[PDB]
């Protein structure tokens, strides 16, 4: 029941000592299903440090302190094992390999593109798959609708402009425009499809008056000649 988020809400509300999530046998064990070993760098570890530093005063009303100390012992043991493996890795380095540049350029571009979940090439009907396209379009829409509007830029070429305390250089909004062109092109996607349907169904509905090899055909010329036959009168 969001045991890692309840401590964050109690830290943001500045009232983590009056309730302290009320860790008991029926409350601290229901939200955990021993803490579940969070995987953040410091966003969920400093909260555990503060949660240990606050509860040093009651000293008996919370029973998960032993599990938190065992988790800290596991973290220290993993840190010591990682330092011994880092020493073994730095002592196990061969002297000469002469690593090339082209394979490095192949690895860096692919590892940069695989960070932010986009397509990378190798260079080494159907409604079931359209919902999967719409779920990726709406994902980027909901991602671009969470950016702050007060976004400014700073390039490495501004030092020739001599920006004073009140200067207003003309290279501040070079990324705020590009953060809106994508957001308003993902919304006009259904707008351009109507123009494409009005264009293709007007340039391809005839297809036998401007294209020469389709109007120079023996079947098509005879058909266009024979559909214009006026009905014969009687007597």
């Amino acid at each position: 029941l969001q045991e890692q988020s309840e401590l964050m809400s109690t830290v943001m509300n500045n009232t983590p000592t009056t309730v302290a999530a009320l860790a008991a046998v029926a409350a601290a064990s229901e939200t955990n299903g021993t803490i579940p070993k969070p995987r953040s760098s410091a966003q969920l570890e400093q909260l555990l440090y503060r949660y240990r530093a606050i509860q040093n005063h009651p000293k008996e009303n919370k029973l998960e302190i032993k599990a938190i100390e065992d988790t800290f012992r596991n973290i220290s043991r993993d840190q010591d094992i990682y330092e011994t493996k880092l020493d073994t890795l730095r002592k196990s380095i061969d002297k000469g390999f002469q690593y090339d540049e082209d394979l490095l350029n192949k690895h860096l571009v692919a590892l940069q593109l695989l960070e932010k979940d986009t397509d990378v090439p190798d260079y080494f009907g159907d409604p079931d798959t359209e919902i999967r396209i719409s779920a990726r379009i709406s994902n980027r829409i909901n991602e671009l609708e969470r950016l702050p509007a007060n976004l400014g830029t700073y390039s490495l070429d501004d030092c020739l402009e001599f920006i004073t305390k009140d200067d207003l250089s003309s290279r501040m909004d070079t990324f705020k425009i590009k953060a809106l062109v994508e957001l308003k092109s993902l919304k006009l996607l259904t707008k351009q499809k109507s123009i494409r349907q009005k264009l293709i169904n007007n340039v391809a509905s005839q297809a036998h008056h401007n294209i020469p090899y389709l109007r120079d055909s023996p079947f098509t010329a005879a058909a266009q000649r024979s559909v214009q036959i006026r009905s014969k009168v009687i007597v």
């Binding site: 397509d119 798959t129 396209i133 993902l186 996607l189």
Partner: protein, 34 residues
């Protein structure tokens, strides 16, 4: 001419015999002995 969903299409979804016959006919239409 705006590629918008062209990235997402690539994310989701990743003869000779008659030409040789026509070349053989073009070689047969050069000499009168064939």
């Amino acid at each position: 001419s705006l590629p918008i969903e062209d990235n997402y299409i690539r994310e989701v979804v990743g003869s000779k015999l008659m030409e040789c016959v026509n070349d053989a006919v073009q070689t047969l239409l050069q000499g009168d002995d064939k």
